[PDB]
Design an enzyme around this catalytic site. Structure first.
Site, mmCIF file in Angstrom:
data_model
loop_
_atom_site.group_PDB
_atom_site.id
_atom_site.type_symbol
_atom_site.label_atom_id
_atom_site.label_comp_id
_atom_site.label_asym_id
_atom_site.label_seq_id
_atom_site.Cartn_x
_atom_site.Cartn_y
_atom_site.Cartn_z
ATOM 1 N N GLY A 1 7.062 6.319 1.574
ATOM 2 C CA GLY A 1 7.804 5.237 2.613
ATOM 3 C C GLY A 1 7.887 4.903 3.924
ATOM 4 O O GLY A 1 8.908 4.385 4.674
ATOM 5 N N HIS B 1 -0.331 -2.913 1.127
ATOM 6 C CA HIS B 1 -0.559 -2.505 0.166
ATOM 7 C C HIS B 1 0.945 -2.225 -0.370
ATOM 8 O O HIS B 1 1.192 -2.085 -1.444
ATOM 9 C CB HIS B 1 -0.931 -1.063 0.098
ATOM 10 N N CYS C 1 5.045 4.255 5.675
ATOM 11 C CA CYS C 1 4.271 3.204 6.323
ATOM 12 C C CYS C 1 5.017 1.835 6.271
ATOM 13 O O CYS C 1 5.709 1.754 6.219
ATOM 14 C CB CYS C 1 3.140 2.221 4.838
HETATM 15 O O1 LIG Z 1 -1.159 7.132 1.536
HETATM 16 C C1 LIG Z 1 -0.447 6.951 0.898
HETATM 17 C C2 LIG Z 1 -0.825 5.619 -0.414
HETATM 18 C C3 LIG Z 1 -1.501 5.256 -0.463
HETATM 19 C C4 LIG Z 1 -1.361 3.383 0.834
HETATM 20 C C5 LIG Z 1 -2.517 3.097 1.206
HETATM 21 C C6 LIG Z 1 -4.089 2.436 -0.444
HETATM 22 C C7 LIG Z 1 -3.579 3.876 -0.718
HETATM 23 C C8 LIG Z 1 -2.652 4.611 -1.316
HETATM 24 N N1 LIG Z 1 1.228 6.943 1.009
HETATM 25 C C9 LIG Z 1 1.460 7.709 1.673
HETATM 26 C C10 LIG Z 1 1.841 8.421 1.824
HETATM 27 C C11 LIG Z 1 2.487 9.579 2.456
HETATM 28 C C12 LIG Z 1 2.090 9.393 3.389
HETATM 29 N N2 LIG Z 1 1.122 8.453 4.730
HETATM 30 C C13 LIG Z 1 1.461 7.468 3.175
#
Ligand SMILES: O=C(CC1CCCCC1)Nc1cccnc1
Ligand SMILES: O=C(CC1CCCCC1)Nc1cccnc1
EC number: 3.4.19.12
Lengths: 304, 304
Positions: free
Chosen positions: B143, B41, B145
């Site tokens: 950020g 992503h 991820c």
């Molecule tokens: O989840 C998202 C965005 C998703 C990611 C996958 C594709 C769709 C958008 N960001 C995030 C924020 C806080 C902790 N973890 C991840």
């Protein structure tokens, strides 16, 4: 989102951990520049540990009696000295992995990461608080001694704690890196009761702000209170008195959340007086006091 | 003595963390040998994130569009490919800090250490469980991820988790290092409810053994039970059914403590049916399910 009892990344500290052996006793040392710092009870035998004459014991020890091993390479020990309750072993080689570091004596209520070690080898890392009674609630066995606590500001490792002894109550005591005990503790094999432990009120409040930020808010009430009212309730429940200093430090969390500090105090007051009624806050069924306001800001913004 | 939610030492993983930037989006990558692994992503824009055609998006991207930075040195990207939900970026340099490692798909109930990272920089480390519903209860922001979960057997780092997305419920979902989601989750911007989460019964029992070992024993009762009796109680309280496998794995803790597994089940049964009556076990007011029997043995013996 989410909120976790997060430790500092331990890599910069791993690179400083060595094994220290004197006579039969082995424990952990901290190798920074050309000095290795370890607990001075490394020089003790089981017959000594009652009331060790550390000065008289150390007379009998030479640089060659201090076996210092980093992974599978021995350090040559060119000097030894006792500062309070630590030994400083001068070695002939600077630790090439010496990070930027300071030695900081932390205040009770302040948190830090412990890298628990055995035979100079890391086993794991967890976040801790210096209890108001200058004890820590660790996870430490025989051979964990010389494990150190620390904080990290970007690239600077502030060493605050070296682990020395476990009290008969199973709580931990230790020194700064100048080998001064936190609290009244002496490095002997005697019963040493820890004073009354209070809850670190400012940290609970900071944790209540972390909860609100992460969407746990069921404990927000329609009440407020006063420093002096709240502190009557704190006393009863052995919370630390709240001061304007504590309120000042909560200002970032107050500002972000727009929940006045004294309003949150009134939330805390009601939780103390009524308990949690079988609910949880950030996956805890009690009031967590081992996150500082600094800790909450760091984790909730993601400082590195 | 003492018992802590301990993470693995994170140093071996710190040395593998990089920053990955595609168009505007930045997140974390894992640099092992001459490959960097990151969430796919990274190639998305806010207009794409609804239902991203990752194949069509990737067509438009060249090795030169993948900006890979380790501290303050850029990696040259000589290849890119998509395996499930991760990108493999072949770089021209082997990570000189590549530890011994494997890629392991963990089972729900199994634990691991997360090194939460932003812009390829570590912020901290904490211990986690793969929930029975294949979610984790993390601490992750925008950020974070590409942050990875792992275990460490002496010198071998087993990578089990890469962080991808936060569900609208604020729980975390992610992949193995072959980019297969744990659970039914897809990397899209859609509501994806997590199934019912059960308590990991064997881990609570292991934690009850850890409690007894560390001197918290007030919950030991004069009762026993049967797998089938205990499991009637488990159902009611959304605990995982206990099997002979689970009992077999508790054998080391049973043997050490000399408390038969079914006796401890009867302790658990009573705690489920009567609650903790405002008492605590190892400083927790609820039943901790994120220590495995393996975790308890390691920490209580001090494996490194
Ligand atoms: O989840 C998202 C965005 C998703 C990611 C996958 C594709 C769709 C958008 N960001 C995030 C924020 C806080 C902790 N973890 C991840
Ligand atoms: O406390 C001792 C022995 C003390 C050490 C100081 C001198 C008297 C003997 N060992 C230990 C065990 C588990 C965790 N921490 C420390």
């Amino acid at each position: 989102s989410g909120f976790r009892k997060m430790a500092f990344p331990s890599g910069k500290v791993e690179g400083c951990m060595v094994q220290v052996t004197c006579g039969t006793t082995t424990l952990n040392g901290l190798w920074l520049d050309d000095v290795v710092y370890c607990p001075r009870h490394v020089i003790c035998t089981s017959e000594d540990m009652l009331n060790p004459n550390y000065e008289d014991l150390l007379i009998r020890k030479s640089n060659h009696n201090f076996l210092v091993q980093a992974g599978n390479v021995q350090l040559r020990v060119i000097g030894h000295s006792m500062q309070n309750c630590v030994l400083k072993l001068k070695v002939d080689t600077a630790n090439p992995k010496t990070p930027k570091y300071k030695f900081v004596r932390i205040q009770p209520g302040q948190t830090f990461s412990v890298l628990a070690c055995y035979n100079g080898s890391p086993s794991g890392v967890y976040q801790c608080a210096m209890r108001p009674n200058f004890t820590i609630k660790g996870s430490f066995l025989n051979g964990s001694c010389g494990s150190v606590g620390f904080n990290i500001d970007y690239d600077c490792v502030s060493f605050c704690y070296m682990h020395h002894m476990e009290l008969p109550t199973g709580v931990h005591a230790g020194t700064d890196l100048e080998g001064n005990f936190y609290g009244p503790f002496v490095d002997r094999q005697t019963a040493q009761a820890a004073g009354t432990d209070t809850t670190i009120t400012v940290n609970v409040l900071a944790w209540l702000y972390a909860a609100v930020i992460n969407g746990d808010r069921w404990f927000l009430n329609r009440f407020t209170t006063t420093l002096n009212d709240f502190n009557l309730v704190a006393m009863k429940y052995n919370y630390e008195p709240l001061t304007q200093d504590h309120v000042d430090i909560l200002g970032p969390l107050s500002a972000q959340t727009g929940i006045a500090v004294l309003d949150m105090c009134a939330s805390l007051k009601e939780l103390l007086q009524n308990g949690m009624n079988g609910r949880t806050i950030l996956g805890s069924a009690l009031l967590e006091d081992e996150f500082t306001p600094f800790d909450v800001v760091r984790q909730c913004s993601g400082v590195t």
